Design a protein around this ligand. Structure first.
Ligand SMILES: [Zn+2]
Ligand SMILES: [Zn+2]
Length: 324
């Protein structure tokens, strides 16, 4: 059983320790091309990404899942360069990231567009998963969509359905962005269920931000896994809160439904570079191994439970294949 990766197919037994929600480069593509100074030196950016990810691999993570999609500045030829120079597995994603409306590109054709007819968004996702992204030969391993503050706008809803149908065609797992405080997981579960989606093939992201056990257990009950995936993002939820919710959930026997990450990156255009290392010093790829894991053991999370979240769960998730 294999899954596709920025360096081709790997045995799913070779996934190993997997962070289920990371990024390498995030940017608004058109702004970066037009105002390139902040990005600066392309080779330095790329080499820097390779350094950060190689370090991560040397520390004992085997795989990251990069959930950068359309709207987040996805550019796979640059990811191909990074992946070619690290032994870290990089799983790449397709889908579309919006809190509200869809790109102008979708404004004229498709369900709810000015004109319309066939959805064309789904086809684009399927092409990425099954054929490969652009000229690249790299296929997407996972689907990503979002629901935030605005909730189910017609744009957000169109994308959720496009992503649901791409998932039913290919069998690729869905990984989700949500606003946890507004409990947007429940919203996505509803749309997905209406689409006939097997909710156990869905990771609801950013549940790590929540401290509401009832909400998490309600998402699990419908079948989904939970992204405990913004470790280090302490402005949204302090270290202790993030560690406790995971600990509690393990004690309630939900380790088999949780995956971990930082939602970190090497570059994020929308924020001043020099400020973020001082305001969120723990927001990097090594925080889980340096701090979070020990703190978890301190709360009596077993080694078996950690293995489940970091190794067993991602592998199970990625071994479920084929559409329906
Ligand atoms: Zn997100
Ligand atoms: Zn993210």
């Amino acid at each position: 059983p294999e899954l596709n990766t920025a360096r081709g197919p790997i045995d799913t037994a070779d996934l190993g320790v997997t962070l289920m929600h990371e990024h390498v480069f995030i940017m608004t593509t058109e702004i970066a091309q037009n105002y390139p100074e902040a990005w600066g030196d392309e080779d330095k950016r790329v080499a820097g990404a390779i350094a950060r990810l190689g370090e991560l691999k040397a520390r004992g993570v085997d795989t990251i899942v990069d959930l950068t999609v359309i709207g987040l500045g996805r550019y796979i030829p640059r990811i191909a360069r990074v992946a070619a120079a690290t032994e870290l597995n990089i799983v790449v994603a397709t889908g579309l990231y919006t809190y509200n409306d869809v790109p102008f590109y979708f404004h004229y054709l498709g369900p709810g567009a000015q004109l319309d007819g066939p959805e064309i968004m789904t086809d684009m996702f399927v092409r990425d998963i099954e054929h490969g992204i652009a000229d690249t030969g790299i296929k997407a391993g996972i689907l990503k969509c979002a629901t935030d503050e605005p909730g189910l706008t017609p744009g957000v809803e169109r994308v959720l359905r496009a992503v649901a149908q791409a998932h039913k065609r290919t069998g690729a797992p869905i990984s989700t962005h949500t606003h946890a405080g507004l409990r947007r997981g429940l919203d996505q579960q509803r749309i997905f269920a209406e689409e006939g989606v097997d909710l156990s093939r869905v990771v609801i992201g950013h549940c790590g931000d929540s401290t509401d056990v009832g909400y998490l257990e309600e998402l699990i009950a419908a079948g989904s896994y939970l992204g405990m995936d913004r470790f280090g993002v302490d402005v949204i939820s302090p270290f202790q809160d993030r560690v406790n919710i995971v600990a509690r959930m393990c004690e309630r026997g939900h380790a088999d439904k949780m995956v971990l990450s930082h939602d970190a990156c090497c570059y994020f255009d929308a924020l001043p570079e020099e400020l973020v290392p001082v305001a969120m010093p723990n927001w990097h790829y090594l925080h889980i191994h340096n701090d979070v894991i020990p703190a978890l053991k301190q709360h009596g999370v077993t080694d078996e439970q950690l293995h489940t979240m970091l190794v067993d769960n991602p592998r199970r998730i990625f071994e479920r294949q084929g559409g329906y």
